Amino acid sequence: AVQKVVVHPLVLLSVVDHFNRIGKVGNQKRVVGVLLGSWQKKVLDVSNSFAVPFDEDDKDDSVWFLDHDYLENMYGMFKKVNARERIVGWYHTGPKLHKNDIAINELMKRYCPNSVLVIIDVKPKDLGLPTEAYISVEEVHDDGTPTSKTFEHVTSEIGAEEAEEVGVEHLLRDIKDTTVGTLSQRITNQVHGLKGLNSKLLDIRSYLEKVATGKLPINHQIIYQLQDVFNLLPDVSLQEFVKAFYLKTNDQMVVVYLASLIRSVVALHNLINNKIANRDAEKKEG
């Protein structure tokens, strides 16, 4: 239904400052706010946000509040001050997918049809992309309940823009990994993404904690993929997968062998370009 989402770094930042402004409560508060944006060409866009007053008490945690007058007038100001801008859905600060977010989405779907949510990070530590988004799908289906509804993650990335790329690249001024040569790939995804595969091997190790001791629902629809992964584990090293591998090493290295051969001759022509400027000035200048 939706291809992907596009998040600007402003709305990425426009939650953190509110997380600072309610950080004096100390005890517990999740930041929940209205997400504004304009989805076009089946691509979800996210532009602007604010945060709505929201509290939560732990005993009987089914009692939420959205001050809709604050939602009515401030969006009416925002529809005034940017008529290109509209509602796109909502968000919450999302540490660990709290329970009220099954009907918050159903509370305010009378504005946005595909009222998408966004889970963000306030304490960043990962090896992935710390912005997560779901979508609302419902089912009268296989086994669980007559009324069943579960969120599904549509893929997420941080979109840039020519206005804000001026800003963020001025705001970094920090340790950087520019000059992409032979080394940026080695550290953006060869040092890093191999350890990125750690926390996904270890993630399914964490579901594996129920062998005879963990939580009481057992499998039914979790193991059809896990049965496939050991089935779609790749081909063993006996076939011409051995032979055609040596074939292309015997082709890819020849281009490197030519290209390195050129590198020696070019700097040797540079060597004479310094022996023309060494000997032809010691008699001239002194």
Binding site: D58, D61, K96, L97, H98, K99, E132, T150, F151, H153, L197, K200, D203, I204, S206, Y207, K215, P217, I222, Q225, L226, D228, V229, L232, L233, P234, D235, Q239, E240, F241, A244, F245, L247, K248
Partner: protein, 91 residues
């Protein structure tokens, strides 16, 4: 038979057509000069085969396909487990 078989004998195919083995060869002749079914028949061992090129490059190419299908699947389960622990032990 081109789709689901790899290497069938000449006698076996003529038996599922209930006609002569030479009449079978005239059928596979005017279809691959029509090149609408590819086949590489034999008239000494009776060993024909279907969709069998030399395959220099498609081995590692289809192998690289199986990595990306695998890596797209290991990302599917990971963000599906972490919600499943949040519907039993949330608060």
């Amino acid at each position: 038979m081109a789709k689901y078989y790899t290497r069938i004998t000449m006698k076996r195919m003529a038996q599922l057509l209930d006609l002569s083995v030479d009449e079978s060869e005239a059928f596979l002749s005017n279809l691959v000069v029509n090149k609408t079914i590819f086949a590489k028949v034999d008239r000494l061992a009776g060993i024909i085969n279907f969709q069998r090129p030399k395959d220099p490059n498609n081995l590692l190419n289809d192998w690289s396909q199986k990595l990306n299908s695998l890596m797209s699947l290991v990302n599917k389960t990971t963000h599906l487990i972490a919600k499943e622990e949040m519907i039993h032990n949330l608060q």
